[PDB]
Amino acid sequence: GMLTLIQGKKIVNHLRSRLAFEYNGQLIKILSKNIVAVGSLRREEKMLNDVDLLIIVPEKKLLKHVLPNIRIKGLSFSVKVCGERKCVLFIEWEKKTYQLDLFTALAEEKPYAIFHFTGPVSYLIRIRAALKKKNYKLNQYGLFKNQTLVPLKITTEKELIKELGFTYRIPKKRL
Amino acid sequence: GMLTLIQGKKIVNHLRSRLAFEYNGQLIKILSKNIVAVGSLRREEKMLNDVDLLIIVPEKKLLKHVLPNIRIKGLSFSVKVCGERKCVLFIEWEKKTYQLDLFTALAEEKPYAIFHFTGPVSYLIRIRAALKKKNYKLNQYGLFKNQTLVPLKITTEKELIKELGFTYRIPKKRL
DNA sequence: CGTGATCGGAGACGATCACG
DNA sequence: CGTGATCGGAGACGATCACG
């Protein structure tokens, strides 16, 4: 279902403290630090068909356990599909049902992933096509030339966009 | 069932003219030239539990079609198991049932195969163990050193046995 | 010593829908 | 442009018996 951006912010603010995964029986929570609102929500659209968040896992081994054992404090939800990298929830928010998408990225790959998951799709098609015609492949995980990772001395998404050879835009003016 | 060597010779002499395979619907016969009596029959034992023959296929592509489409002129038989390299028959010979084993070898590999299929097993265990302790592997198909075929300028089984570093013995005095 | 034929069961693999 | 999750179906692969 669709929801306003204001409802979206309220929903996200609720979840920031109430997400967790169980690791061999014990329940570890995800810190707000490692939760990033993305998708149409970060683009600040008036209407949203889903709520997308991206969770930063600080260790590669934990990808096994985070999304497939995701838990939400006191909130009814069903699982649509779920793997190690993408998890789609149907959440119940005040007697209504909204689609909630979760995704995972490790620390090394955080800037590349934030750029991918905020979009929009048309914006990235044009960016990756431009880099495709210089023999580059760019994905959520990194930038590649000859099946090899290109080491960019970067940290933020903003430094990445400029290092790829385009001007940084606030997310809400990417089209 | 078991049969005398004299019955064995009579059985083999019958088959030499009456074996054939169908190749995409047409029935091609195997020439006596390319049929070699092996096993305990070649060792000339008094009693045999089977009749083993080895058929030389003059082209690698025909391995698909020879044994799996084997035909015997006017003789009742059932198939026990059958592949491209080994075929085991239950033949009916004068109101009795005898096991008939067929095997295939290409021209390149004829001497190595004749040495394998006449045996006996104890004789080859000792020969191949001796070559194993000089980093050689010998099989029905060739002699190998470092996963590579060893090119022996040989033709007959007798030249092979001497080139491997052992004296030739008539088949009936191999133990 | 070294390989073959057969059985049966798993795991990449293409097709499909989905994610930004 | 580039990848993910899921379904379902095939083909090497180990175990077993067999071949000299």
TrEMBL record, chains A, B:
Chain ranges passing through the membrane: none
Protein name per its UniProtKB record: Repair DNA polymerase X
Record has DNA repair as a keyword: yes
Protein's UniProt keywords contain NAD: no
The organism of origin for this protein: African swine fever virus (ASFV)
SUPFAM superfamilies found in the cross-reference section: Nucleotidyltransferase
Alphabetical list of Gene3D superfamilies matching this protein: Beta Polymerase, domain 2, DNA polymerase, thumb domain
Biological classification of the source: Viruses, Varidnaviria, Bamfordvirae, Nucleocytoviricota, Pokkesviricetes
Cofactor(s) required for function per UniProt: Mg(2+)
InterPro entries, alphabetized: DNA_pol-X_BS, DNA_Pol_thumb_sf, DNA_pol_X, NT_sf, PolB_thumb, Polymerase_NTP_transf_dom
GO-annotated molecular function: DNA binding; DNA-directed DNA polymerase activity; metal ion binding
